[PDB]
Design an enzyme around this catalytic site. Structure first.
Site, PDB file in Angstrom:
ATOM      1  N   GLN A  36       0.819  -1.204   0.000  1.00  0.00           N
ATOM      2  CA  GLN A  36       0.000   0.000   0.000  1.00  0.00           C
ATOM      3  C   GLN A  36       0.857   1.261   0.000  1.00  0.00           C
ATOM      4  O   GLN A  36       0.625   2.183  -0.788  1.00  0.00           O
ATOM      5  CB  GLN A  36      -0.924  -0.023   1.218  1.00  0.00           C
ATOM      6  CG  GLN A  36      -1.877   1.139   1.317  1.00  0.00           C
ATOM      7  CD  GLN A  36      -3.170   0.877   0.583  1.00  0.00           C
ATOM      8  OE1 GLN A  36      -3.411  -0.230   0.103  1.00  0.00           O
ATOM      9  NE2 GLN A  36      -4.013   1.893   0.494  1.00  0.00           N
ATOM     10  N   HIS A 120      -3.846   5.143 -11.948  1.00  0.00           N
ATOM     11  CA  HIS A 120      -4.250   3.826 -11.481  1.00  0.00           C
ATOM     12  C   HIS A 120      -5.727   3.574 -11.747  1.00  0.00           C
ATOM     13  O   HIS A 120      -6.125   2.422 -11.941  1.00  0.00           O
ATOM     14  CB  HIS A 120      -3.906   3.643  -9.992  1.00  0.00           C
ATOM     15  CG  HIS A 120      -4.537   4.651  -9.080  1.00  0.00           C
ATOM     16  ND1 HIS A 120      -5.885   4.658  -8.791  1.00  0.00           N
ATOM     17  CD2 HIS A 120      -3.998   5.675  -8.378  1.00  0.00           C
ATOM     18  CE1 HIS A 120      -6.151   5.649  -7.960  1.00  0.00           C
ATOM     19  NE2 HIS A 120      -5.023   6.281  -7.692  1.00  0.00           N
ATOM     20  N   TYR A 193      -8.427   3.307   4.161  1.00  0.00           N
ATOM     21  CA  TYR A 193      -6.996   3.464   4.379  1.00  0.00           C
ATOM     22  C   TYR A 193      -6.688   4.392   5.547  1.00  0.00           C
ATOM     23  O   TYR A 193      -5.614   4.272   6.135  1.00  0.00           O
ATOM     24  CB  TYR A 193      -6.276   3.916   3.094  1.00  0.00           C
ATOM     25  CG  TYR A 193      -6.335   5.380   2.691  1.00  0.00           C
ATOM     26  CD1 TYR A 193      -5.603   6.353   3.365  1.00  0.00           C
ATOM     27  CD2 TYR A 193      -7.054   5.773   1.575  1.00  0.00           C
ATOM     28  CE1 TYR A 193      -5.638   7.677   2.971  1.00  0.00           C
ATOM     29  CE2 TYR A 193      -7.092   7.091   1.171  1.00  0.00           C
ATOM     30  CZ  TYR A 193      -6.386   8.039   1.868  1.00  0.00           C
ATOM     31  OH  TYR A 193      -6.438   9.352   1.449  1.00  0.00           O
ATOM     32  N   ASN A 236     -16.683  17.476  11.629  1.00  0.00           N
ATOM     33  CA  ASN A 236     -15.901  16.259  11.497  1.00  0.00           C
ATOM     34  C   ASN A 236     -15.486  15.984  10.064  1.00  0.00           C
ATOM     35  O   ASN A 236     -14.554  15.203   9.843  1.00  0.00           O
ATOM     36  CB  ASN A 236     -16.684  15.062  12.033  1.00  0.00           C
ATOM     37  CG  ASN A 236     -16.879  15.120  13.528  1.00  0.00           C
ATOM     38  OD1 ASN A 236     -16.132  15.792  14.240  1.00  0.00           O
ATOM     39  ND2 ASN A 236     -17.881  14.404  14.017  1.00  0.00           N
ATOM     40  N   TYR A 252       3.135   9.343   4.546  1.00  0.00           N
ATOM     41  CA  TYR A 252       3.121   9.251   3.091  1.00  0.00           C
ATOM     42  C   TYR A 252       4.239  10.083   2.484  1.00  0.00           C
ATOM     43  O   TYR A 252       4.982   9.611   1.620  1.00  0.00           O
ATOM     44  CB  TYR A 252       1.761   9.692   2.547  1.00  0.00           C
ATOM     45  CG  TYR A 252       0.594   8.950   3.146  1.00  0.00           C
ATOM     46  CD1 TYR A 252       0.712   7.623   3.526  1.00  0.00           C
ATOM     47  CD2 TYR A 252      -0.624   9.578   3.337  1.00  0.00           C
ATOM     48  CE1 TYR A 252      -0.348   6.945   4.079  1.00  0.00           C
ATOM     49  CE2 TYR A 252      -1.695   8.906   3.886  1.00  0.00           C
ATOM     50  CZ  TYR A 252      -1.552   7.590   4.258  1.00  0.00           C
ATOM     51  OH  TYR A 252      -2.614   6.915   4.808  1.00  0.00           O
ATOM     52  N   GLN A 253       4.379  11.328   2.933  1.00  0.00           N
ATOM     53  CA  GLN A 253       5.437  12.217   2.464  1.00  0.00           C
ATOM     54  C   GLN A 253       6.562  12.335   3.479  1.00  0.00           C
ATOM     55  O   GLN A 253       7.102  13.421   3.689  1.00  0.00           O
ATOM     56  CB  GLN A 253       4.875  13.596   2.126  1.00  0.00           C
ATOM     57  CG  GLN A 253       3.592  13.587   1.308  1.00  0.00           C
ATOM     58  CD  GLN A 253       3.707  12.809   0.018  1.00  0.00           C
ATOM     59  OE1 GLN A 253       2.771  12.122  -0.380  1.00  0.00           O
ATOM     60  NE2 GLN A 253       4.845  12.920  -0.649  1.00  0.00           N
ATOM     61  N   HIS A 254       6.919  11.235   4.134  1.00  0.00           N
ATOM     62  CA  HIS A 254       8.082  11.223   5.008  1.00  0.00           C
ATOM     63  C   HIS A 254       9.343  11.365   4.169  1.00  0.00           C
ATOM     64  O   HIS A 254       9.539  10.630   3.201  1.00  0.00           O
ATOM     65  CB  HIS A 254       8.117   9.927   5.815  1.00  0.00           C
ATOM     66  CG  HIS A 254       9.200   9.883   6.846  1.00  0.00           C
ATOM     67  ND1 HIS A 254       9.021  10.343   8.131  1.00  0.00           N
ATOM     68  CD2 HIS A 254      10.479   9.445   6.778  1.00  0.00           C
ATOM     69  CE1 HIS A 254      10.140  10.185   8.812  1.00  0.00           C
ATOM     70  NE2 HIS A 254      11.041   9.645   8.012  1.00  0.00           N
ATOM     71  N   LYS A 333      21.442  11.892   1.897  1.00  0.00           N
ATOM     72  CA  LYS A 333      21.187  12.643   3.118  1.00  0.00           C
ATOM     73  C   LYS A 333      20.214  13.784   2.854  1.00  0.00           C
ATOM     74  O   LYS A 333      20.365  14.536   1.888  1.00  0.00           O
ATOM     75  CB  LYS A 333      22.496  13.179   3.697  1.00  0.00           C
TER      76      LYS A 333
END
Ligand SMILES: Nc1nc2c(ncn2[C@H]2C[C@H](O)[C@@H](COP(=O)(O)OP(=O)(O)OP(=O)(O)O)O2)c(=O)[nH]1
Ligand SMILES: Nc1nc2c(ncn2[C@H]2C[C@H](O)[C@@H](COP(=O)(O)OP(=O)(O)OP(=O)(O)O)O2)c(=O)[nH]1
Ligand SMILES: Nc1nc2c(ncn2[C@H]2C[C@H](O)[C@@H](COP(=O)(O)OP(=O)(O)OP(=O)(O)O)O2)c(=O)[nH]1
Ligand SMILES: Nc1nc2c(ncn2[C@H]2C[C@H](O)[C@@H](COP(=O)(O)OP(=O)(O)OP(=O)(O)O)O2)c(=O)[nH]1
Ligand SMILES: Nc1nc2c(ncn2[C@H]2C[C@H](O)[C@@H](COP(=O)(O)OP(=O)(O)OP(=O)(O)O)O2)c(=O)[nH]1
Ligand SMILES: Nc1nc2c(ncn2[C@H]2C[C@H](O)[C@@H](COP(=O)(O)OP(=O)(O)OP(=O)(O)O)O2)c(=O)[nH]1
Ligand SMILES: Nc1nc2c(ncn2[C@H]2C[C@H](O)[C@@H](COP(=O)(O)OP(=O)(O)OP(=O)(O)O)O2)c(=O)[nH]1
Ligand SMILES: Nc1nc2c(ncn2[C@H]2C[C@H](O)[C@@H](COP(=O)(O)OP(=O)(O)OP(=O)(O)O)O2)c(=O)[nH]1
Ligand SMILES: Nc1nc2c(ncn2[C@H]2C[C@H](O)[C@@H](COP(=O)(O)OP(=O)(O)OP(=O)(O)O)O2)c(=O)[nH]1
Ligand SMILES: Nc1nc2c(ncn2[C@H]2C[C@H](O)[C@@H](COP(=O)(O)OP(=O)(O)OP(=O)(O)O)O2)c(=O)[nH]1
Ligand SMILES: Nc1nc2c(ncn2[C@H]2C[C@H](O)[C@@H](COP(=O)(O)OP(=O)(O)OP(=O)(O)O)O2)c(=O)[nH]1
Ligand SMILES: Nc1nc2c(ncn2[C@H]2C[C@H](O)[C@@H](COP(=O)(O)OP(=O)(O)OP(=O)(O)O)O2)c(=O)[nH]1
Ligand SMILES: [Mg+2]
Ligand SMILES: [Mg+2]
Lengths: 453, 453, 387, 381
Positions: A36, A120, A193, A236, A252-254, A333
């Site tokens: 995933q 996709h 998800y 909410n 996700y965007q780490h 790095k």
């Protein structure tokens, strides 16, 4: 006979005998080998889950919401056959993902084939068409009450889209807001998800899908029928897109998870001209051409990674070198992160020039953080009804909800990396990036004062 | 310096720089491609976790138990060198697993090479020696205050197991942490209890954080042991009761075990035709890749998809089985029963069912459900202290605890499958099985009166 | 109209407007002041949940099981009002509990008035009878389509051909709220998940799975609620869960001794504590359902805060509890940890079915399932405490 | 000797024997009859938890954080004497809460006594003084290693507030654990985030254990965190601003709190509570004497029920509630209109001793523009 599946996210889920016939095919079981979150597993060890279990959960939630609408509103005249066709789309909406999910269609293919139109969603219906024919399910769908030609259209319309719809009358337009909501993005795919990624990574989800379903209701608005929710729930829904945006900046965007994603594509690009995937009628395909033959795309999973790494071919040595860099944790790095302005946002047509721009002041990645509707507010495309008049759907504006809500709904982030792990390089590379931000009038980095005053 | 890993089971877990460099190697990262539960993923779709994430949990729990003993009782003089060596044993305890974990050392290797005795503990230590040598960490272990000669023995003895020479008998308790050969209470069980249950969607009835709060080392028979208090003998009985539920619910599921069987069947028919490379460039088969670590390093679950996507006409017999798995045309389960059957007799039962559809048409699966030590109660080898004198280790026998505890501690299950799936074959297969139970005087099948009146 | 309730155990549950009217009565709302676990809160600080929320879950699960049966099997003629009655009994199964629950009907009354035989089940039908009459709601029940004379008798029969609520053709609806035949009822499934979550302990029975396979079968010409062959090991684990909850929390030796000290404080305070139009004591409030309404855990702190010297001996013992000067564990406490049916095996009262014929109920013996199951099913324990 | 308490939130927590002796007193056990969320229990059934369970968690986390800084930074000279005083301050910063917690000092007391100036910290320090003197703990505090004169003052200052007389400015970072006044990042918030969500059935969105793994002290001295955690710090204040919207300021839940004020204001004439030497106090007056405030719990609600004021409680038990009285609610990040992250310093993985300032513009543009707002609800009686 109905089958039951125990799931850590939803518990026991019942599957129609036709749903089982679609599952137990090579074109669906393929999804057990696409992760995933792609490269995010190399940063969060719990994210081992694949597209297969996600697809089952989307098919379950679609059936849950489509059934609550028919049980609470028999006026809609929703039939068991509509519900089934709704559940097939939820199951098959993920068929078209490639190796490591959003790395294939968001990085590799955009780099290997800059002028091809590929998503996709497109792959899901291309694979769904190959799934039905290659397994002889036309007759099976007839046996369970489906009229193929119309219903095959209806299923493919929920996944991708195009009153332009041929699969269902406009009088049932609300069925297209369940699996993939092109109007505002509140669909059953996001809810699964949210809960399944948070379970596996170990972070927190701030949206309760079950409460939303209990207040879902079709209402007429601008002569069309939409899925609406109660006014008391508008807060909410903002928190659902805050959940999704918070999920992106954490996992996700780490920046390390993404640099590992860029290293896999660069390894994939260098292995592309030499990997041969046997397609339909014996033809051979590359990694970047398998999307043209569904019989070859079936066999294009994460196995490509280990195929490149466990290889002996000298032509694959350069691609194997990048993967070995990953298994040894010798990664590029991360040097800094900055932000442009809304009016100074970098266009994709200029992405190929920035490492030259920072060296004259390297790996630069641009991520766009929006609520789904580009720079537009998705809630303004949502209608709300009161308890005194459930058929009157009104507009709740952002200023009516809260003064603490985001001023903007979209932004851009620039992450810069260096391929040289030298202590002198990482210092010098950090000096270039800080002066690069002052020159281009970008925002000041968080580590700017300590690494470079 | 130290790194922090976020885990859905244990949260943020810190790892010593030496542990980081041990896991950032191709022989450890190889565990990312070994399914923890093997064939259970095809029955419990949430069970997609791999041996990699399990290894970090065992090593983190190893560190939690030895850090508590060190802090509570300085008398034992546990050094940081000792605590580091225990964590290393926790991480590397699983390095010796093959494709689909217990399928490899329990099904494929016994049938491919019956002459050789092989275990994953032997694999873990052999893989551990190859890990430190190929990546040159003997000097790195020296840098962090370890004595490689004695400590590598100590790391290896914790995995495999006064016979030990890596630690003096005064530190004998340090051998009950990672792999407790005495009674089975070890940190490796606690992690897979909580990790498997998280992913399977099963409930876990044991709390390790409470056990660790009462773990204490006491002298008895002049030897030091890890002990817990009087009040915890009930929770200790449930720990082996939990392990039995996880084996009955998930690890020995009738359909998951037949899928493991078919992956072995496919493996043995593919074993002569696929080559794994390593050590000095020699080629190795699946069954002989255990003799060399450079080959065994590249022997993961990838073997499954290489057989499935293969082009070689010499691999159709094996590819035929794996596609029966993908389309789910599995052998049909006929019934379960109970008697002890010697493992040397396992090969003969198929012909016995046919004598009550030829012999090859049946598959008989014998499972030994025990408490970890054959037919012995493991609690009999556990010592308990009380609040009055915490330094005296008494014995609590099964009668003093409760009278609802099990009568015996070892049983065997026998499952019969049929490779023929038509309605007439399944019928006769059901009749043979019920008769076969009378011929050998077994326990009455649960559905026998309904299926064979 | 329909209201939804967010519960930490079951999520958002919908309640029929009739059930909302029964909830909003003084006789149901008083259960917010009866600790579910009584004296466990003084040992497990998480167990602060009362009887009120427990009841909302027993009736939610009651609706869940009854509705799954009618949807899978329309051949049962389960009406939408059958399902309303099964729900009602689930909600009101707990009305007849006293101060601190098992402290009241389990210890206090057996010593205060040994002549009477008092059960919380018998308290429920009287408090329920008072509930419907004092709020004028036999009116509302006929409005939502129920026949009171038969349906009310149906409701009470589930709490406590012998039955007159409904005929043997509907004999399986009495197996939902309070199963007298083997004990597999919705009441256990809720406090399993609800006590575990508040206590900090681990539940090991999946009730949503048991509901998925539940199906009625004609056995001995009577309709019985059955489950599948494959769910028998999970039934043994159900009572094994119930036993762990008793050995870890419900019969904790310090939790029991605190319950016993509250009894002794109530025993000495019994003749001087007056509850109103006659006046009643703690020991006689069970005889007037108008008094039992005002008899909650508040009776604890009314003794602790009083100043009349007549109650000094009782208050001196609740003073011993707030400073943790408890009876040292060495008062003799005898505990019978069974499987809900004395020394019997409840599984021998359960029938199962197969995939081949889902209408042929069959009995599965213990020797058929596993050889590692318990030898006996009842067991006695003796504990003494120094006053 | 030490005692272990099993918790649904924190698990098995260990308590110093001196902590147990503070727990086993009438003035602390009183908190078993003060529900934490007050009237939110009548809207959220699962929210039946009391201040007592919360108090044990505040002190446990106050002990986790301070012990964490001990073992990573020995250059700070943190003693087992300071860790005890922090954990005591964590346990006793909720002693001064009246019946139904915030209904008492947020609505009732300001309406019953408009001249008075009452806060639950004032009660917490006053009843902490009343706890140690009534139970003779001064000789036991000293027995366990404390200096009662200086440490008590330190304990009462972590609750109320170089103007400190219990610890020197060379240890200013220990006032930032129990009740942080600089920015609001304290262990008390982290306990009710997890304990209210667990019982209300609401979702949390702040990882407190991750925040502790990145805590460092930096030069006065203030508690700082890594630069990569500034995003989690807004979501901390966002989590709880989200907690007020769903449960704390629930319209039907707030109106129930107001109807219990009215029922208390009407019963204030005839409410009798015996105090210091038999002197009778009312509900509105039991705050002036901790002997009476000790016996002032939710018990008064049922005392009125079982006895004009009984009518309103009867209207609440029968759901004859006011339909959606004008209530004003202040929604803020804790610092009026100010931005709490501006008072937070951060360090990098380069110079862990160099604290830096991170502004909102450097984090994200999808953050709030303002930091305070007020809602107005109207009801019909
Ligand atoms: N929560 C839970 N799940 C289970 C248990 N046993 C099996 N499963 C899971 C695995 C499957 O994903 C799913 C269905 O497995 P089942 O054993 O109930 O059905 P199976 O097809 O194996 O047998 P059947 O076709 O009904 O004769 O439930 C259990 O005891 N508890
Ligand atoms: N080194 C390593 N990190 C892992 C692994 N699995 C998950 N993680 C996490 C822990 C790290 O904090 C996080 C980020 O990876 P790294 O720290 O190795 O890359 P980074 O760019 O931060 O460079 P660094 O080594 O910290 O200077 O990945 C693993 O197998 N090895
Ligand atoms: N590691 C990683 N995952 C991503 C990225 N973008 C999307 N995803 C992941 C997060 C979710 O698990 C999942 C959601 O994307 P999907 O392809 O399943 O559907 P979709 O594109 O419609 O998502 P959306 O509606 O925009 O939220 O993929 C990315 O850039 N990196
Ligand atoms: N629960 C949680 N985990 C996170 C978050 N951000 C990253 N992680 C997870 C992923 C990793 O397994 C682990 C370490 O990630 P970090 O970003 O904190 O370390 P990294 O090496 O990438 O940055 P660094 O080199 O220390 O500057 O925690 C977060 O916001 N919440
Ligand atoms: N059919 C199927 N079951 C799955 C799958 N993934 C997990 N499960 C679960 C649901 C099943 O009840 C359970 C056992 O699988 P099967 O029912 O197909 O095996 P079985 O020999 O019992 O076949 P049968 O029920 O007689 O049709 O595994 C899947 O992809 N396909
Ligand atoms: N699918 C499946 N998993 C198994 C089987 N046997 C063991 N396991 C799984 C369950 C655990 O997650 C894990 C534990 O086995 P390990 O070999 O890693 O540890 P160990 O040898 O110490 O087993 P033990 O602690 O004595 O139960 O492997 C099996 O027969 N089938
Ligand atoms: N999970 C969740 N529960 C909420 C939320 N807000 C309120 N609740 C809980 C409290 C109740 O037990 C239940 C019903 O709350 P509602 O506010 O939706 O009902 P209410 O009668 O106050 O509004 P209404 O009369 O329909 O206008 O859900 C929320 O935002 N999330
Ligand atoms: N002392 C005390 N224990 C509590 C409290 N709340 C929950 N618990 C738990 C922790 C204790 O281990 C457990 C048993 O209570 P005690 O230890 O005070 O009574 P015990 O008979 O064990 O006497 P002991 O002092 O240990 O010799 O109650 C509390 O407020 N005070
Ligand atoms: N503290 C405590 N609670 C008990 C005791 N016995 C029963 N209970 C509590 C634990 C459960 O939350 C709950 C279960 O019993 P119930 O009062 O609800 O009724 P019932 O007798 O039908 O339950 P059962 O069928 O026996 O499992 O009451 C006891 O001896 N001590
Ligand atoms: N998670 C868990 N908690 C338990 C269990 N048994 C008792 N407790 C809880 C109740 C207390 O809050 C806390 C500690 O009480 P304990 O029963 O272990 O010790 P206690 O003081 O009653 O006996 P002691 O004075 O040490 O002889 O743990 C258990 O089996 N599992
Ligand atoms: N039912 C209800 N609870 C409230 C209200 N306002 C605050 N609270 C409750 C929610 C929390 O459980 C708790 C948090 O406030 P505390 O009394 O624990 O301390 P404090 O005022 O310092 O909270 P803060 O630091 O500002 O977040 O009080 C309200 O208006 N209604
Ligand atoms: N009516 C009622 N609501 C409860 C109860 N327990 C939890 N809740 C929740 C569900 C409700 O949606 C929520 C708000 O309470 P109400 O709906 O009764 O008051 P509201 O002002 O919304 O008037 P309404 O009847 O909805 O027009 O409280 C209860 O016992 N009775
Ligand atoms: Mg019962
Ligand atoms: Mg505060």
């Amino acid at each position: 006979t109905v089958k039951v599946i125990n799931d850590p996210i939803h518990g026991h889920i019942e599957l129609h005998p036709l749903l089982i016939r679609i599952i137990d095919t090579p074109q669906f079981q393929r999804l057990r080998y696409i992760k995933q979150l792609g490269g995010g597993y190399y940063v969060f060890p719990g994210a081992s889950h694949n597209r297969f279990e996600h697809s089952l959960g989307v098919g379950y939630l679609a059936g849950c919401l489509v059934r609550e609408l028919s049980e609470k509103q028999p006026e809609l005249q929703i039939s068991e056959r509509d519900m089934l066709c709704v559940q097939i789309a939820g199951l098959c909406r993920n068929l078209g993902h490639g190796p490591f999910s959003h790395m294939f269609d968001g990085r590799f293919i955009p780099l290997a084939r800059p002028d091809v139109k590929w998503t996709h969603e497109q792959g899901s219906v291309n694979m769904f068409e190959h799934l039905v024919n290659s397994n002889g399910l036309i007759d099976v769908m007839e046996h369970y009450g489906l009229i193929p030609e119309e219903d095959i259209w209806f299923i493919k319309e929920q996944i991708t889209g195009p009153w332009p719809y041929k699969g269902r009358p406009k009088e049932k337009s609300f069925l297209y807001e369940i699996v993939a909501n092109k109007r505002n993005g509140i669909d059953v795919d996001k809810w699964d998800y949210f809960a399944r990624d948070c379970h596996h990574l170990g972070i927190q989800n701030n949206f309760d899908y079950k409460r939303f379903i209990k207040f879902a209701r079709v209402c007429e608005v601008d002569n069309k029928k939409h899925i609406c929710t109660r006014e008391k729930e508008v807060g909410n829904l903002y928190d659902m897109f805050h959940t999704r945006n918070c999920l992106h900046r954490r996992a996700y965007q780490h920046k390390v998870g993404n640099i590992i994603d860029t290293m896999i594509t660069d390894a994939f690009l260098k292995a592309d001209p030499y990997i041969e995937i046997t397609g339909s009628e014996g033809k051979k395909y590359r990694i970047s051409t398998a999307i043209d033959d569904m019989e070859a795309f079936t066999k294009l999973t994460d196995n490509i990674f280990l195929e490149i790494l466990y290889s002996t071919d000298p032509k694959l040595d350069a691609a194997r070198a990048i993967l070995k860099k990953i298994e040894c944790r010798n990664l590029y790095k991360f040097v800094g992160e900055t932000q442009p302005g809304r009016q100074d946002k970098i266009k994709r047509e200029n992405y190929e020039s920035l490492p030259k721009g920072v060296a004259s002041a390297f790996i630069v990645d641009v991520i766009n953080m929006d609520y789904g509707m580009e720079d537009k507010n998705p809630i303004d495309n949502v209608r709300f009804y009161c308890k005194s008049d459930p058929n009157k759907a009104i507009i709740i504006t952002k200023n009516q909800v809260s003064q603490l809500l985001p001023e903007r709904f979209a932004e851009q982030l620039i992450r810069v990396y260096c391929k040289k792990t030298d202590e002198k390089s990482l210092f010098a590379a950090r000096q270039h990036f800080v002066q690069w931000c002052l020159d281009n009038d970008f925002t000041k980095p968080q580590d700017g004062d300590v690494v470079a005053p």
